[PDB]
Amino acid sequence: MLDKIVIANRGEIALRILRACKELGIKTVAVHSSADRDLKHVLLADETVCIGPAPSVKSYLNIPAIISAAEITGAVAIHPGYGFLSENANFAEQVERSGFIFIGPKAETIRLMGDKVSAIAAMKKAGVPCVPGSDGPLGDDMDKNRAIAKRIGYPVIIKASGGGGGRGMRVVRGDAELAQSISMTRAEAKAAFSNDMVYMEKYLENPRHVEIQVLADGQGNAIYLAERDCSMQRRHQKVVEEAPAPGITPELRRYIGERCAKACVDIGYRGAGTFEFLFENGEFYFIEMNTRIQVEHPVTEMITGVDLIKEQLRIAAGQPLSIKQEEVHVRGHAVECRINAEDPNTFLPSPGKITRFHAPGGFGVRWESHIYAGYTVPPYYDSMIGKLICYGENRDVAIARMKNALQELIIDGIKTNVDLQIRIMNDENFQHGGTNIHYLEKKLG
Amino acid sequence: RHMLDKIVIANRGEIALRILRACKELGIKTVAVHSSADRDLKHVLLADETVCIGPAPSVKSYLNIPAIISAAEITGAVAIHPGYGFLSENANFAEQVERSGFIFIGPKAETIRLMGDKVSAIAAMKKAGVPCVPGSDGPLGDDMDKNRAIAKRIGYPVIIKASGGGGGRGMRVVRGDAELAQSISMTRAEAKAAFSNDMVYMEKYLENPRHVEIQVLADGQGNAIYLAERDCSMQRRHQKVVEEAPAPGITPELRRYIGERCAKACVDIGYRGAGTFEFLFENGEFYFIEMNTRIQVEHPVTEMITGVDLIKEQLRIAAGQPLSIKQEEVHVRGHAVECRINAEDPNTFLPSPGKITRFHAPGGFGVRWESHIYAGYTVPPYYDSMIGKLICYGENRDVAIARMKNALQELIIDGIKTNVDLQIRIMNDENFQHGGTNIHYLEKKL
Numbered sequence: 001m002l003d004k005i006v007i008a009n010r011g012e013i014a015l016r017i018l019r020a021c022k023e024l025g026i027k028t029v030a031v032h033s034s035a036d037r038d039l040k041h042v043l044l045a046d047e048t049v050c051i052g053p054a055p056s057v058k059s060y061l062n063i064p065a066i067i068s069a070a071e072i073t074g075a076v077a078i079h080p081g082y083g084f085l086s087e088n089a090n091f092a093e094q095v096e097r098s099g100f101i102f103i104g105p106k107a108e109t110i111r112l113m114g115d116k117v118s119a120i121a122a123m124k125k126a127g128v129p130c131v132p133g134s135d136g137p138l139g140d141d142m143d144k145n146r147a148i149a150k151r152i153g154y155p156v157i158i159k160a161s162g163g164g165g166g167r168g169m170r171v172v173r174g175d176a177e178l179a180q181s182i183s184m185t186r187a188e189a190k191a192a193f194s195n196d197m198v199y200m201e202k203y204l205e206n207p208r209h210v211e212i213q214v215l216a217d218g219q220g221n222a223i224y225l226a227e228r229d230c231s232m233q234r235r236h237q238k239v240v241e242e243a244p245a246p247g248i249t250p251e252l253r254r255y256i257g258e259r260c261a262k263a264c265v266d267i268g269y270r271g272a273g274t275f276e277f278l279f280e281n282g283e284f285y286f287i288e289m290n291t292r293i294q295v296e297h298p299v300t301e302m303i304t305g306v307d308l309i310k311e312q313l314r315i316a317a318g319q320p321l322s323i324k325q326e327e328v329h330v331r332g333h334a335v336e337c338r339i340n341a342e343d344p345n346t347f348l349p350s351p352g353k354i355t356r357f358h359a360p361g362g363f364g365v366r367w368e369s370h371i372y373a374g375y376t377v378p379p380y381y382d383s384m385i386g387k388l389i390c391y392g393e394n395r396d397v398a399i400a401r402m403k404n405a406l407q408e409l410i411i412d413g414i415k416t417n418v419d420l421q422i423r424i425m426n427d428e429n430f431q432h433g434g435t436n437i438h439y440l441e442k443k444l445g
Numbered sequence: 446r447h448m449l450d451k452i453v454i455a456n457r458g459e460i461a462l463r464i465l466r467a468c469k470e471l472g473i474k475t476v477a478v479h480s481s482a483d484r485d486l487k488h489v490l491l492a493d494e495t496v497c498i499g500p501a502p503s504v505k506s507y508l509n510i511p512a513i514i515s516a517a518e519i520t521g522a523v524a525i526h527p528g529y530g531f532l533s534e535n536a537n538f539a540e541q542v543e544r545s546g547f548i549f550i551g552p553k554a555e556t557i558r559l560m561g562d563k564v565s566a567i568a569a570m571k572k573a574g575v576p577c578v579p580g581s582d583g584p585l586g587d588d589m590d591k592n593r594a595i596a597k598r599i600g601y602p603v604i605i606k607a608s609g610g611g612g613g614r615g616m617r618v619v620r621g622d623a624e625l626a627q628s629i630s631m632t633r634a635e636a637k638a639a640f641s642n643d644m645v646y647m648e649k650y651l652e653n654p655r656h657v658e659i660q661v662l663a664d665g666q667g668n669a670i671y672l673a674e675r676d677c678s679m680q681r682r683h684q685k686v687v688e689e690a691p692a693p694g695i696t697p698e699l700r701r702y703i704g705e706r707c708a709k710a711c712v713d714i715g716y717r718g719a720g721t722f723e724f725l726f727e728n729g730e731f732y733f734i735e736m737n738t739r740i741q742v743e744h745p746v747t748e749m750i751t752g753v754d755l756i757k758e759q760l761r762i763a764a765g766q767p768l769s770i771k772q773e774e775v776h777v778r779g780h781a782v783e784c785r786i787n788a789e790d791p792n793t794f795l796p797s798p799g800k801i802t803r804f805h806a807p808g809g810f811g812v813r814w815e816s817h818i819y820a821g822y823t824v825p826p827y828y829d830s831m832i833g834k835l836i837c838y839g840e841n842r843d844v845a846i847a848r849m850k851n852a853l854q855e856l857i858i859d860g861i862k863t864n865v866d867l868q869i870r871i872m873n874d875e876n877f878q879h880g881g882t883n884i885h886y887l888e889k890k891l
């Protein structure tokens with residue numbers, strides 16, 4: 001095992017990693033901004049280092065300060081969590097050249113999957129089904145771009161090669177909008193990602209968001225740990241996640257999973273990763289790969305029994321995968337509700353002091369949050385303050401437990417999306433299952 | 446399938462909240478019956494209906510048979526869940542409930558009566574094939590020559606036990622003939638005063654036993670299953686502190702052997718609902734001591750390793766539904782540890798009442814928190830010291846223990862004294878980390 005690690009993150013994920021470290025007897029170094037002295041994980045860590053003032057650019061995104069804290073404490077590894085520097089290939093490369101273990105994939109793999117054009121090319125080569133599109137970058141020749149748009153099937157989407165998630169996209173209904181659209185995206189991409197490379201892709205009308213969890217040791221072994229349905233979204237931001245995805249057969253799971261596992265070997269993947277797809281008419285279409293742990297990883301842990309953070313730590317330590325594909329079994333169902341310090345109606349973030357707090361309990365109830373009574377949610381960071389995960393023997397039990405747990409959850413002093421989550425659990429279409437990616441916006445409209 | 450419309454939760458604290466959650470999941474309307482001191486209980490605050498049944502002393506509230514039955518009638522409830530303790534093993538209450546036309550969420554009154562009489566309960570178990578402690582196999586008379594002959598056949602040390610006794614009450618260890626007559630006479634007088642039943646029996650006293658118990662479920666359709674075992678040996682002066690499932694050192698073959706015998710005994714006695722067969726385990730052999738005719742405090746450790754919601758099964762059985770799982774569907778997976786959290790003084794072990802000023806619950810993968818407490822809540826001095834239960838699960842015993850250590854360190858209960866520090870000490874104990882420690886261990890450590 002790794003003797004001592006730096007947790008290069010904050011909030012709920014930092015607390016998640018800290019628990020995993022403590023379970024394995026790994027010493028923890030909590031690096032934090034001056035605004036995050038009162039974070040729960042900071043108070044629980046063996047050593048703490050203040051890495052700079054409140055803005056992320058000065059603290060959590062500050063590479064030299066993070067490296068220096070790792071050198072000063074005698075740490076051997078760095079876990080970047082999710083967000084911040086987790087998908088920054090230059091950070092991964094610097095961590096390794098400085099002699100530390102980077103708890104993530106190789107910097108080259110981050111670059112390969114990070115550039116969306118080459119990622120799709122790599123997946124097509126690996127045998128992973130992708131969304132029909134340009135299959136390369138787009139030029140200045142409108143005649144070639146229009147011929148490509150008719151080849152795929154209108155409507156189409158203009159995507160930034162350096163973009164990802166919910167940023168760097170523009171939908172095209174017809175050829176009249178096409179020219180203005182290919183130009184606006186290039187200007188936005190060059191300003192936001194410092195790369196003007198764009199590509200064209202088929203805009204799928206009625207798709208579901210289905211993603212595959214993988215674990216690869218970087219020694220030739222790679223396993224798939226079922227799927228997650230993350231279709232309940234608003235402004236390209238996940239709200240509810242669940243595992244397994246409803247309507248996915250053991251045969252469909254096996255088909256897509258084996259392809260994802262094979263793709264890991266072919267790209268030399270190391271650690272935990274997720275292959276995101278759009279699922280429509282019984283077919284999967286690759287969109288992107290998250291080369292880190294995901295926010296929604298707990299729903300996969302509940303249904304497989306696999307602790308995903310401990311496995312990241314074992315792989316980083318140089319241990320080959322002990323878990324064999326034949327040992328991965330889907331059992332029961334899990335639902336995750338993201339808890340955000342925001343007004344759901346207006347999207348207005350709600351930082352501030354939590355005057356009253358009470359977490360739900362019970363069988364199959366998992367609460368993932370650093371929040372406590374008297375704690376101030378700082379205005380400098382993202383709105384996500386916690387995650388409520390409920391497990392049951394079937395989908396209906398997990399939903400029933402989630403309704404009860406949401407009713408027990410008290411967060412006063414700030415605005416939350418708790419009431420929105422209660423509305424989603426009570427939604428008859430959600431209760432039936434299989435709602436598409438556009439459902440939540442339509443329901444709220 | 447048909448389900449109970451509304452039930453009265455005839456209990457308080459953590460178990461009342463546990464029962465409330467199971468009801469809500471099943472769409473059953475809840476009736477929280479409470480004493481005047483228990484208006485601010487979490488489950489009372491979450492219940493669909495509330496009925497104040499009397500003042501703080503349990504005799505006028507939680508043990509008050511007419512007021513509890515009256516609250517079921519007033520609210521139009523169809524069933525009564527007694528939880529554990531209070532009226533849960535009271536056969537007169539269960540008889541009065543049935544008589545009043547309400548469902549008693551438990552076994553038949555006559556089954557409670559049968560298992561509540563320790564002499565009759567042993568005779569029924571021995572007849573069914575359940576292994577028993579060698580003993581008198583009937584009541585002791587006043588003839589001391591006969592009592593010395595029974596003691597010689599059993600072999601000293603022996604234990605004199607009250608037929609109306611149970612748990613940690615109504616027993617006396619005898620090491621030789623010199624103490625026999627007086628020990629029998631003293632047990633009789635104590636039994637007459639406490640139980641209005643002076644019947645005593647003799648049992649072989651075991652030197653280093655483990656307290657291992659088998660969980661059962663039996664429906665009204667003739668199905669009876671076993672849900673592995675629990676080791677409750679980590680205890681002090683008849684008070685459980687740590688429980689775990691499955692029991693260390695128990696092989697699948699040993700589990701199958703004892704479990705099948707317990708399942709067969711349910712069928713023979715016409716058992717209904719949740720129940721536990723309590724055993725003393727020593728030298729790879731099981732010895733029946735008593736049967737709990739209700740749910741136990743430590744039921745969550747069995748739920749974690751089997752996936753079975755024991756409270757929801759009680760509610761399903763009571764509604765007239767078959768068991769939701771078959772024996773072949775019951776699988777032991779992983780390991781679970783329960784730390785009882787008490788508002789108690791660590792030097793005296795007596796209840797420590799008062800107001801909770803700051804409260805923080807632990808979280809994480811495999812962490813389960815069973816408690817009604819919240820910040821600002823006042824622990825009343827009228828009832829037991831138990832304020833909560835911390836349950837950690839893992840794919841093996843070591844992971845469960847590692848998760849417990851971290852969970853206990855995150856647990857904050859300020860304003861009152863707790864056994865949190867003692868629980869941290871037990872988790873750090875190398876003999877506990879090895880496992881298989883006997884019932885006498887904790888007292889010897891302290």
Ligand SMILES: NC(=O)c1cc(N)c2c(c1)nc(NCc1ccccc1Cl)n2C[C@@H]1CCCCC[C@@H]1O
Pocket residue numbers: 116131157159160161163164165166167168169201202203204205209233236237278287288437
């Ligand atoms: N081909 C498509 O129809 C399509 C549609 C969407 N909405 C895509 C979508 C495809 N791909 C992406 N995202 C990746 C991306 C964005 C910008 C530039 C490149 C990439 Cl790879 N997104 C955005 C997503 C936000 C939430 C909805 C479901 C999944 C996505 O995370």
Ligand SMILES: NC(=O)c1cc(N)c2c(c1)nc(NCc1ccccc1Cl)n2C[C@@H]1CCCCC[C@@H]1O
Pocket residue numbers: 563578604606607608609610611612613614615616648649650651652656680683725734735884
């Ligand atoms: N035969 C024996 O060795 C024996 C010993 C004890 N200590 C017995 C014990 C046997 N049996 C009982 N209890 C049941 C009982 C008591 C009085 C009268 C009838 C009964 Cl069934 N107890 C009380 C125990 C409390 C301490 C820890 C856990 C094991 C036991 O609960």
